Each structure stands twice: as structure tokens, then as C-alpha cells.
């Protein structure tokens, strides 16, 4: 009667984990990368030094 009972319980947990894996990748896309760009902002004393 219930060969399809399963799945739904994991779908909520799995969707969450997969999302979270990307959440971590996502903050890198901008926070870590802009922090890297911050280094450029710090580097870009270059023009002053030049």
C-alpha cells in the first residue's frame, strides 16, 4: 500500500545538506574573494607609492 512512504523524509534533510554545501561555497565566492580583493585594495596603495 505504501511502497512510496520513504523518500520524503530524506528529501528534506538531503535538500538541506546539498544546499548547505553550496552555502559554504557561496560565501567563498564573495566573502573570501572580496576579502582577496581587499588585499588588492590594500595593494592599491601601489598608486600612492608609485
Three-state DSSP class for residue 44: coil
**Residue 36 grid coordinates:** 582577496
Report in angstroms the alpha-carbon separations of 5 from 12, 14, 16, 31, 49.
14, 16, 20, 41, 68
Task: Tell me which residue has cell 561555497.
Answer: 25
**What is d(CA 19, CA 9) in angstroms, rounded to the nearest whole number?**
16
Say how many Å lie between the first and final Cα of the chain, rounded: 78
Q: From the centroid of its chain, how far is CA 6?
A: 30
Report in angstroms the alpha-carbon separations of 3 from 12, 13, 48.
19, 20, 71
**What is d(CA 40, CA 33) in angstroms, rounded to the nearest whole number?**
11
Method: cryo-EM
Amino acid at each position: 500500500q505504501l511502497n512510496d512512504l520513504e523518500k520524503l523524509y530524506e528529501e528534506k534533510q538531503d535538500a538541506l545538506m546539498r544546499h548547505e554545501r553550496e552555502r559554504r561555497e557561496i560565501i567563498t565566492y564573495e566573502q573570501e574573494m572580496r576579502y582577496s580583493k581587499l588585499v588588492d585594495a590594500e595593494r592599491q596603495v601601489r598608486e600612492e607609492r608609485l
